[PDB]
Amino acid sequence: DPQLLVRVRGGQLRGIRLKAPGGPVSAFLGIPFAEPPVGSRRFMPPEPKRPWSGVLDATTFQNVCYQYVDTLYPGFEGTEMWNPNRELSEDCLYLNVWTPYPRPASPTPVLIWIYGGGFYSGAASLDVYDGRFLAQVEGAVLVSMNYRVGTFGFLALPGSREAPGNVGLLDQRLALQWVQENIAAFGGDPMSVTLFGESAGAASVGMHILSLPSRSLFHRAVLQSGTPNGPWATVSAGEARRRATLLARLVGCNDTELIACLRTRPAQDLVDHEWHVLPQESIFRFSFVPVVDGDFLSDTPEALINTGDFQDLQVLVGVVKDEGSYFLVYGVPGFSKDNESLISRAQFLAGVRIGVPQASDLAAEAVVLHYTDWLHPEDPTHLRDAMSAVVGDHNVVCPVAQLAGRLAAQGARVYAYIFEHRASTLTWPLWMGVPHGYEIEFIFGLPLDPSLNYTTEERIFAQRLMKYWTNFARTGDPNDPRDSKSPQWPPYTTAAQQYVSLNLKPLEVRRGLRAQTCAFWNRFLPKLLSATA
Amino acid sequence: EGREDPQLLVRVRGGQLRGIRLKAPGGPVSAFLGIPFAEPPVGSRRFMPPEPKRPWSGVLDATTFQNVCYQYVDTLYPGFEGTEMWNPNRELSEDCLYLNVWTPYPRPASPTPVLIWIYGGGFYSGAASLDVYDGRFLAQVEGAVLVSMNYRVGTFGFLALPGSREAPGNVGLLDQRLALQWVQENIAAFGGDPMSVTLFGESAGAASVGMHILSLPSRSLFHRAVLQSGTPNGPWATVSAGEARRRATLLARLVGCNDTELIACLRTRPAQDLVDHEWHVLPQESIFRFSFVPVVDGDFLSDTPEALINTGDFQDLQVLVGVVKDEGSYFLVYGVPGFSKDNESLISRAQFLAGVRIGVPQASDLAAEAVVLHYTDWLHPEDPTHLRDAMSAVVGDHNVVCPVAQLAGRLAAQGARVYAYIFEHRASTLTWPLWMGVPHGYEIEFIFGLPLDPSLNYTTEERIFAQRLMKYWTNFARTGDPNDPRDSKSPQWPPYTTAAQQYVSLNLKPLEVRRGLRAQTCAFWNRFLPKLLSATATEAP
Ligand SMILES: NC(=O)c1cc[n+](COC[n+]2ccccc2/C=N/O)cc1
Numbered sequence A: 001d002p003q004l005l006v007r008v009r010g011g012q013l014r015g016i017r018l019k020a021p022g023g024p025v026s027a028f029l030g031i032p033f034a035e036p037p038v039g040s041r042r043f044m045p046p047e048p049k050r051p052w053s054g055v056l057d058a059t060t061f062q063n064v065c066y067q068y069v070d071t072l073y074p075g076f077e078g079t080e081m082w083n084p085n086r087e088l089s090e091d092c093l094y095l096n097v098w099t100p101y102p103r104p105a106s107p108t109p110v111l112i113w114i115y116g117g118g119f120y121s122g123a124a125s126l127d128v129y130d131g132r133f134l135a136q137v138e139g140a141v142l143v144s145m146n147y148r149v150g151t152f153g154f155l156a157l158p159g160s161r162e163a164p165g166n167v168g169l170l171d172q173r174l175a176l177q178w179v180q181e182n183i184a185a186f187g188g189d190p191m192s193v194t195l196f197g198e199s200a201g202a203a204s205v206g207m208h209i210l211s212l213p214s215r216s217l218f219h220r221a222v223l224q225s226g227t228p229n230g231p232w233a234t235v236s237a238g239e240a241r242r243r244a245t246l247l248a249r250l251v252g253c254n255d256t257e258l259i260a261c262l263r264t265r266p267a268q269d270l271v272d273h274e275w276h277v278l279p280q281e282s283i284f285r286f287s288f289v290p291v292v293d294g295d296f297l298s299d300t301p302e303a304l305i306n307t308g309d310f311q312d313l314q315v316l317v318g319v320v321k322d323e324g325s326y327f328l329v330y331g332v333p334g335f336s337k338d339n340e341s342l343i344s345r346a347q348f349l350a351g352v353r354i355g356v357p358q359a360s361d362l363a364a365e366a367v368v369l370h371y372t373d374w375l376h377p378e379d380p381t382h383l384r385d386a387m388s389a390v391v392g393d394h395n396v397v398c399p400v401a402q403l404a405g406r407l408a409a410q411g412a413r414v415y416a417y418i419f420e421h422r423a424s425t426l427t428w429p430l431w432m433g434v435p436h437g438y439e440i441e442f443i444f445g446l447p448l449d450p451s452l453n454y455t456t457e458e459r460i461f462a463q464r465l466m467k468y469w470t471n472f473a474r475t476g477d478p479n480d481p482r483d484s485k486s487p488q489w490p491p492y493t494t495a496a497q498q499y500v501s502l503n504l505k506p507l508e509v510r511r512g513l514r515a516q517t518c519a520f521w522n523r524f525l526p527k528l529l530s531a532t533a
Numbered sequence B: 001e002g003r004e005d006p007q008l009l010v011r012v013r014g015g016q017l018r019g020i021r022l023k024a025p026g027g028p029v030s031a032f033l034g035i036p037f038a039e040p041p042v043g044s045r046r047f048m049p050p051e052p053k054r055p056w057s058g059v060l061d062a063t064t065f066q067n068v069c070y071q072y073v074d075t076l077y078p079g080f081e082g083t084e085m086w087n088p089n090r091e092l093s094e095d096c097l098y099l100n101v102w103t104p105y106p107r108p109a110s111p112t113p114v115l116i117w118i119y120g121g122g123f124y125s126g127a128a129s130l131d132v133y134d135g136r137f138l139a140q141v142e143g144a145v146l147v148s149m150n151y152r153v154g155t156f157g158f159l160a161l162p163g164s165r166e167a168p169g170n171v172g173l174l175d176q177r178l179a180l181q182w183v184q185e186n187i188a189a190f191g192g193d194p195m196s197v198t199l200f201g202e203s204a205g206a207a208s209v210g211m212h213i214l215s216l217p218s219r220s221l222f223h224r225a226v227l228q229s230g231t232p233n234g235p236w237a238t239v240s241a242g243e244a245r246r247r248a249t250l251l252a253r254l255v256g257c258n259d260t261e262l263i264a265c266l267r268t269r270p271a272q273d274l275v276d277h278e279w280h281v282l283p284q285e286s287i288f289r290f291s292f293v294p295v296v297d298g299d300f301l302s303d304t305p306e307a308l309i310n311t312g313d314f315q316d317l318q319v320l321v322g323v324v325k326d327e328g329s330y331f332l333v334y335g336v337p338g339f340s341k342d343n344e345s346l347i348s349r350a351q352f353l354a355g356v357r358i359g360v361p362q363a364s365d366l367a368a369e370a371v372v373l374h375y376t377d378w379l380h381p382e383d384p385t386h387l388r389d390a391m392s393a394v395v396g397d398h399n400v401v402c403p404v405a406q407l408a409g410r411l412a413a414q415g416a417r418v419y420a421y422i423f424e425h426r427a428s429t430l431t432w433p434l435w436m437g438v439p440h441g442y443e444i445e446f447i448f449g450l451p452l453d454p455s456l457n458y459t460t461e462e463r464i465f466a467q468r469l470m471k472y473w474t475n476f477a478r479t480g481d482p483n484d485p486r487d488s489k490s491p492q493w494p495p496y497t498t499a500a501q502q503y504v505s506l507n508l509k510p511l512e513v514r515r516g517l518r519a520q521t522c523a524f525w526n527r528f529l530p531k532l533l534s535a536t537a538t539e540a541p
């Protein structure tokens, strides 16, 4: 089948014809885009894949980058759907491509997915990242890469030659170059490339916006539930050096000698200890993440968004209704997926220190005082829902509002949303609402698969979202360019702050993304922590 | 004595009085005006605790109001009724310790519950003789016995060199206490029940009422209390001993003056010299701050009102407290640039930040930033209309609404039966612009039942409404409960409690129960702000 045979710069590939509910798609899975980052290449920037002979089999997903595997609720669908679904290996630098079948006759907009997982986990092979739906229904070319996570991708001894940090983002960048060089062979348009990602994937997309060498490799960006700015996505050079030095201590190890010993260590030994280097007991905080190196990131993301020129940029950003709930069951006492998680006031104060682990006593009190309902100060249902809002606002919603506003003020075309539909098939309890990560299956169009037991209105809703996202990819505007009839999705601006709700009902335009509450986080808290240092 | 009206002659402890028969809309009332209750606090007695009035001979004429206590007179809007209604309507004198009594005509058969009014005016102004404090309507329509007293204001009432013998502070409060004692001894001669005495006051008068609650020797002189738009706790009603000393000393300097020598020199100064300089000793440019106010002396006030209301036992006490809808607006047009009674007062963001520093004069920079961040509308951070209204709310919340919430909460948690209200009707006769809403002091005329006087041009609805307010107040004085026992159908006013936090709206519509007295914002002022001020050293004070 000639539709499954493709020649790229490195040699020949054989893909596989897949069935999507509406017809066939061409899938080329497991394409190597870098030399395996193994042995002495551990912690090093990726190198381009050497050319191969014959026809490389690209009909199956490749290994998942070595990472921690979650065991909190063993074999529960809601946690397992994020766990690695292929073998673990440091040899994991591969990407995946879906195209229409037959291959598009005209050059077609490319979407490039970057998974999240807190920079410590994730894989492009998960079912919720299946590209066949967007390829089949919308005729998109869709690309996803694996990139190194945890210590392997982000352990940094800033200034060292052998662990300069940010190599996981360098993996992404290399995959982006690969798309520039090769996507035309699959019928993709390299002059129309849209990055999209969720949570740490969104933050990664954010870093690419903020890092010059990346800018020639894409045109538009979508950030779902994550930003390069904010309290979890980056660390200073000093804090990264501390964490890497501590980890080295934990496993038996000048910079060169230290990294050399680290390179001798079996992968599982590093994973065993990575989560022991956080300075405070926390949630929504991750041990090894992008570092302000003065290189990939020339300054902090805050500094860079405050001063950048984004005039040529189109960005779509958004959150889910209950960003915080998912994280509560992992670190905060009194929370569980198996009960209503009705907490006491005491447990609420305790939960705030954990959710805002960097806060002084006074800042922590300010948070408690802000989120307490003084009509019902001791009510367990309020306290529980408040706890979730604290985590979600502090980590996602307010950083997103900060980004949207800063980008809009500096020339970017910005569109913002909030996603409010809870999947009928969701396995988490009601009180968690619409948790972090559960818009993705809709954007990727999973409900269009009849065997997945989604409702029919959900199928219809999924098609709307794929339309918005791909319209955005095509044109930088999510609005259907020839469907009339209200309501249109207006651009987010600093003046009017318009965003839309994504749910089963038609678009509703709202103004202000938790404006009062995010003013507390974005404007007041920094002045506070500053003074109370 | 011989041909006069036999119903207007009464004897009190100090001698015989002749009162006057006044006309009220529904019938005659008895008034006894300008009854001395102290020796005149003049000469060597300036700044001193009041001494009880020595008995007189013959029949003291009690048919006209007496002198108003020496005070600063506001002149910002000359001839404008909005300011004039508050100005002195009798001669200014240090010889001003007199009180007034209104009773049914003829006097009541059986002992009648007594109401004692204490006027406001920032502890630097006021008089019991103003038209808005006319007791004739309450006396006539409700059968009430009403008493109001002049007390010393400004320096004469509140200048203190704490610890000294010659100027111990709080003598204005002691004037009020002496009048309360006078009521205990003498009110039965008018048909008043000394065993049923309810204090009420507005603004500084309310704070005064609160101080009698907190001061042991006052407690045996009354049984129930009403606090309208004012509290003894909060940022303006008291000053520390150190601050009172510093202000007394500065004022002394400004007029050309060991505490004995200083005070003695002050006693040689003309009353007007003192008044002309009193306002000049405030530590910052402010509004809703007053130069000479009750001092935490360790005597009348054994501790700060905040400490006292936190630890006090208040079981045998019933209290009615409340606020008007727009406590702050009145104060803006006096002291905050951008504000006026003559335009819409739409202000800039700059003018708003400047207004916050003036309205929260004790705030550190961060505290102020917190206030600004909390009151800013972040969807419209520079809208002149929201800014105007937020400035009003800042001043109202910080000074009245939140101190009131803190009071009702603490009293209720500690055994007092509390009733709370918000007053939301704007008089059709109001001369202030619409943007000011229902300003500080403008419920008073309804409580006293002025709309019952046809010649004042209130609406028929306003007359019925005033009648309603009068029932509430006198029912509360009568029984500790504003609800009418003989009225089941009509909506009930529930007690305020820490758990439910219920209060009622007072307007032209029937009572409506609401929950939470600006609960969210008052958490900022009452819980967070003081912790935030704690983090700052240099300076203020
Ligand atoms: N010496 C003072 O404390 C002082 C304070 C404020 N004002 C003028 O502004 C306030 N004000 C002005 C006019 C009428 C009433 C009021 C305050 N009532 O509480 C004059 C003197």
Ligand SMILES: *[C@@H]1O[C@H](CO)[C@@H](O)[C@H](O)[C@H]1NC(C)=O
Pocket (backbone or CB within 6 Å): B337, B338, B339, B340, B342, B343, B344, B345, B346
């Ligand atoms: C209203 O009048 C006052 C005094 O005349 C002035 O300070 C203020 O700026 C005026 N406001 C407007 C909006 O004209």
